[PDB]
Every structure is written in structure tokens, then in C-alpha cells.
Scaffold this active site. Sequence first.
Site, short mmCIF file in Angstrom:
data_model
loop_
_atom_site.label_atom_id
_atom_site.label_comp_id
_atom_site.label_asym_id
_atom_site.label_seq_id
_atom_site.Cartn_x
_atom_site.Cartn_y
_atom_site.Cartn_z
CE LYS B 97 -3.76 0.35 2.57
NZ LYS B 97 -2.87 1.54 2.69
CE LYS B 146 24.20 -5.64 -28.39
NZ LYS B 146 22.96 -5.21 -27.67
CE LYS B 172 23.16 -11.11 -21.85
NZ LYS B 172 22.52 -10.23 -22.87
CG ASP B 173 20.57 -16.24 -26.93
OD1 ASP B 173 21.21 -16.38 -28.00
OD2 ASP B 173 19.94 -17.18 -26.39
CG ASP B 174 19.85 -8.52 -28.27
OD1 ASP B 174 19.81 -7.95 -27.15
OD2 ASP B 174 19.80 -7.89 -29.36
CD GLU B 175 19.03 -6.54 -23.68
OE1 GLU B 175 18.42 -6.25 -24.73
OE2 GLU B 175 19.60 -5.67 -22.98
N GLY B 331 27.69 0.05 -23.25
CA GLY B 331 28.77 0.93 -23.66
C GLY B 331 30.19 0.50 -23.35
N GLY B 353 28.81 -5.72 -26.28
CA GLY B 353 28.13 -6.10 -27.50
C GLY B 353 28.81 -5.32 -28.61
N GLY B 354 28.59 -4.00 -28.60
CA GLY B 354 29.18 -3.13 -29.59
C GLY B 354 30.70 -3.10 -29.50
#
Lengths: 407, 407
Positions: B97, B146, B172-175, B331, B353-354
Site C-alpha cells: 500500500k 548482436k 549471451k543471447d540478446d535480451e 557501452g 556487444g558493440g
Amino acid sequence: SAVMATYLLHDETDIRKKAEGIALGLTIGTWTDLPALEQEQLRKHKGEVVAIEELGESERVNAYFGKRLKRAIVKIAYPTVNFSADLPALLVTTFGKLSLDGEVRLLDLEFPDEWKRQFPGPRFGIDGIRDRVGVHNRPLLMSIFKGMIGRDLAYLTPELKKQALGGVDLVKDDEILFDSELLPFEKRITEGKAALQEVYEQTGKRTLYAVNLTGKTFALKDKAKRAAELGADVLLFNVFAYGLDVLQALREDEEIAVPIMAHPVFSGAVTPSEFYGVAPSLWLGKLLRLAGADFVLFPSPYEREQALGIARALTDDQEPFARAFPVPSAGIHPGLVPLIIRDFGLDTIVNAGGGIHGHPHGAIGGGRAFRAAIDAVLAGRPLRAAAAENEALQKAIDRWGVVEVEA
Amino acid sequence: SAVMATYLLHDETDIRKKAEGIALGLTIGTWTDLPALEQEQLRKHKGEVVAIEELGESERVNAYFGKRLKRAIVKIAYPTVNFSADLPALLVTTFGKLSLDGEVRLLDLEFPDEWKRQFPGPRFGIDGIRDRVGVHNRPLLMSIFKGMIGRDLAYLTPELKKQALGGVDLVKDDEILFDSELLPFEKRITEGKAALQEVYEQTGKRTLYAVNLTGKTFALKDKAKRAAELGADVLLFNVFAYGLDVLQALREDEEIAVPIMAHPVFSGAVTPSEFYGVAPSLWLGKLLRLAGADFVLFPSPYEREQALGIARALTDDQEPFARAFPVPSAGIHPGLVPLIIRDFGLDTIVNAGGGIHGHPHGAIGGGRAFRAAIDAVLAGRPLRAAAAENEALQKAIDRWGVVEVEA
């Protein structure tokens, strides 16, 4: 084809640019430098900015963030071929990384019909509930079982009867009532049913008991199936502490099939902010209905336009689902029935805890007053008028006041 | 005995008053006017204000709300006898609450040990993961798969091998990669395993594949059990779209028992606000570890103190659970490895990733630069120094720059 998401964006940099980046970044990633031949093959998965609406800067916001922030309502389309047909995928696709992107608030979602047809919607909805309680021309009346923490079954029964005898259509457990030794889930259901059966036999009125469905996620379905077999009337579920998808799972389970009442508890972790989160009309309205909630409780406006928006989503006739019962809650007392009916109409539920138990004559007088208030509004007469010929309602108005609304 | 909750409150009215009301209102309801005899019987369920700390008003906040708001950090104790031992009950009891009460933000939760001993904590944790990959003295390196949306199995394999060949410990896979016809869950696992087994046979190093576990809640366990039988290495789970309790259920299932990597996606609906929601150290840190996540990804600080707080909760030695791998994400590029190790230490994971795929030489050069950056920091030498004798690292720094940190 595509789910269209609507966002509110607060940002310094060029809006149309960020929007374009979102539509692209959250789908195929890159596009400009891919071979034409490869673009043809990925076209179907490409997100597109559907529309933008600048709203101009706000001195208040700017002063708060210490910088100039352009505001806009950006609509973006995410091809349904990009994700599976379930709520978790939907939330992650439309607001997964985006929720971490700064000032971006999810305002609404629009689904193609064929996609939408993959979700259940309410099982009973308003009409289904009205048929089971046999009340078709007035809002329903519901009381909250206050002060049960630390109490046992022996205290439950007389307390439950007292509220029913006040004329309420439903009695719901307190949201924070969990399973315990003092009062187990199955016994609360069983003895609650017997207590109300007695009141039914004494006065001819059947009051429904909305019991709190708690515990661990993977124990829910067995617990619900069992409740259904024991004669539970309504299952109260704190959906926001388990995930929308769990509500839909309970909904689609043919072994449960009892009405589900969704509580707004914890939804406030997501909706209050002006720059982040998800708008309540979507979080408590559109999605809960789509997931399968028959009743949806939400904070009463006594923000107003906000509450109307939720009710609107819950009852919108355009949706291919049955309508869900909007139930404004918190602080409700007889003096507010005129506004409640004005704002929400007849297909709503008057829900009160303190307004029932806190009545000078007790729970019964509390229910009497509400029932009197509801009939007065329906008869088109001022509550102060009816109060003159109705003791309980009179005491309510003297205690909490009233806001009359001319017929 | 009692779970102690810590909140941040912004309000006009007297703080100590609202606090008292909360401690009482959220537990037994009334107290002052109950018979002494009845108070003795309910004492055990009575909530108590444990402490208050005024922080003084803020001109910035005041200007925003158009009124004067007193700020304070209120700690409240809720006897564990009041609720069941599960996360849903905990969240509802401590912020159910209250999340709808206005400006109240949940900052932290403290649990008695006997209570806490009812939750699993990570299954493998840092030590468990380091033993399975056989790397004990350097942070791990992970790349994100990616551009896989719209692609098929035939594209997956060569793309997966390329990242492994760069020397990364995990991929890892992309989310937002969901089950589909193009690439089913079980086949992604099976062919992914065969691809990495090939790279293992050629390089002598086995890279682990973190596969995205998606779909409907009640289909998760069967899907996970199946993944475990097919040889999946790590299960990526978007916990925040399913509820903390689901993560704990996957954790406690002996038929799965594979490491679980928790993604922060959608957690931003709850944490960004200054007046509402739940603090990230609790939402992504303390609770995810307690629930069973072996790895926890969270937004990189490249807010800083915020990220440190999450890592701190994830690795705190005081907890009776194994430590979880903190993984600052978004990043990340080789030029940040010096700061990452400085801020998070060796028991962390460099996730990019990038920074991998966006490297001028491609994914392999991307992995090489990272591996070179990590060794440089560990050798105590400036990245620009090592870059002179390492082409891939050189290209990384020229592309994204670097922030040196003296040994």
C-alpha cells in the site's frame, strides 16, 4: 503485424532522432549499411516511428533537471513477428532496455486484433459477476475485512457475518492477510462459506467472500483449483508482486474458473513518476483486463482524470474482451456515493473498509448507510433528504460529510 | 522476529507522525483504544518505528512540488510472524500500500538470519562459475550476440564461433531474442553447444553460451529442465518481467541446476525516480542474489555510487549466500577495462556487444583487444603502452579512447 507503443520522452537532444534510434535499435539494430538484398529480408522485423508530438518545454521540469528538456509523445511500432505472444515478451520488447534509457515513460500499447485475440480477457467480467450475485441495476457494495492480522478462525466468523448483515454484496480479505496457523487458506474459505450460508439462510441474501490467494507462484494453481473445489467465490490476487503473466495463467486455467479480483498493491512502484515508469491506465487498466482480472481495484480520486482513465480502459466497449469491474478504493464513505456514481456510473463497486467498520453503529450500520446512500442516488434524491428518514445514513453524513450531486 | 525496511520520505506533515502511522497502519491497524488484555495478545504483530533521520528540505525538490517537503530516512520493523516466507509477501508487506502512499521510496530491507535462511541465494555464485570455466585470476570476458533478430540457425553457428575465437569466456543471447520458427530454443542450445565444442576442439578453450529463457511462467520449468538435459551452460532470465519469486523457483529446482544470469531489463520501471519506487541496490542487488541469480547484469556507471552499491550487495561477504557476479553493462569497450577493474575488482565480468562486434577487425579483433586490455591492467601497464605492441587493442583505443588508471 505490429504492436504500437506510446511513450512520453524528456530529453535535450533532437526528439525525432532518439525516436528513430529507438525504432531501429530495439528491433534489427543496423540498417543503413546493410546490402539492399539483406534489407529486403529483414524489412518485416524493422521497427518504425509512427508519430511524434512535441509538447514544448516546461519551466518546472527544466528547473528540476537543471537543463532544457524537450518533451514529446512518440508512438513506435514493433512488428509482432519479433516476439512471442505473451506478456513478458511484450513488456521486454516495448519497455525492456528503454526503461533504463533515462526519461522515457510508457504511456500506452495498441495491439493488432489477431494478436490481442491470443489473450483471454476477463472470464466473467461485469455481466458475469452481476449474474452470480443477482444485482443488475445498482453499483455493488463491498467491505474490507479489517483488523484480522493476529486473529483466528473463531474471530473471523462472527466478524464476517456482521459485515454481510449490513447488506454488502462482497467482503474481501485485507491485502496483507497471508496464510498462517491461526487461519489457514482452506479453512478460511470453508468456514467463511458456512458463515455466509447461515446469513443467507437467515435473511435470504447471499454475500460473496473474496479470499486472498497468496504464497509462491508455483503453488498458486493447485491452491486455486482447491479453492474452487471448496466453494470459494472470488480469488483476491496481488498480481503486481507476481507478474501479469501469472494472472493470465490463473485466468486460463479451466480447473480454477472462479472470478479473480486484482489488487493494486505494489503497482505504485511503477506508476507515480512523471518521467519514468508506466502509466496506470495501462498498468492497472488495459493490461489487467487483457490478462483476465474480473475486478480491478485502484486508488480512488477522492488524481481524478487518472482514475477515470483506468476505469475507461477497464470498461471500454471497443475491446474484444468482457468488461472488468472498476473499483475505486481508499477513503470511501457514504458521503462519496453521489460522486462515485457520477464519475464511474452504475457499473462500479463501492468498496470500503473504514467506511464500514468505522461507522458509529458498527459494521451493520456501516452497510445500512451505504445501501441507503446508493438507493438515494438512484432515486435521484439528496442524501441529506434520505438521511432524515434513515438513521444509519444520517450518522454517516454527520461523521464524514457528503458531496451532493443533483439528479 | 522482524524484517526491517528503510524508506526515503518526502512530505509536508510531521515525519515522526507519518512513520508511526505506517508502522501501526501496515500491521495491526489500531492499538491505542484496544483493551490492555487484547494488546498483550497482539503485541507480537505490532510494527515499530526503529529510527528516523531528518535530512532537511531541498530547494530543488520544493520548487518541483510547489511546496515545502521535509525529507527523512525512516526505518520500520515488520514482525515476520505477520507474513509468509516468500518474496511476494515480503514486497506487499513492506511496500504494498505504501507504494501508493505518495512520496515514499523503498531503500533497503534487512532480514533476521533464520528468516533469510529460508531463501536459496546463488547456486554456483562467483566461485561456482569460476570453477566451471576454469578461470580464477582475472575478470571474465563476455560478448553479446548482436543482430540475431530475423536470423536463422545457419547464421547463428558461424557468428557464435567467431565470438568464441576472440577469446571470450561467454557469449549471451540478446535480451529481446524470443523463441521462433527461425531459431527454436532447444535447437539454439543444441547447435550452439556443437559449435562451441568445435571451437573447443580447435583452440583448447571452451566458451559458455548463455541462452535466453523466455515464454510463459508455467512453461519455464519444463523448458529449463529440458535445457539442462540438452547441455545448456547458462540460462539468461528477464526476471523483472516475471517476478522475483519465479527466479527463486528456477533456482530451487533440482532438475534444472544450471547457472542463472539475471538481466536488468524492465527493472527501470521501478528504480529511476527520486521519490518513488525501489532503490537499485535492493531491486537488482540484494534481492536478486537472495532469489538465486548467479550473475546479475546492471547498467554500467560509464550513476557511479549507485553501481558500486549494487555490486556491493551482490558480493557482500556478510550474507549467508554465495556471492553473485556483478556485471556492469552497456557501452563497455577495451578503454574502460582499467576503470572497471579499479571500481569492481577482479571478480567482475567485462560484458560487451558493440565493443566486440563494432571493432574495426570484427568480433575476433574485438575479443582480442579486450583480452589485451585486461592483461595490460593486470600487468600494471598503461593501455597506450600495450597498444603499441598489440594491433587490436590499438584500434580499440583509437576508436573509443581510453581512461588510464595508474598501477
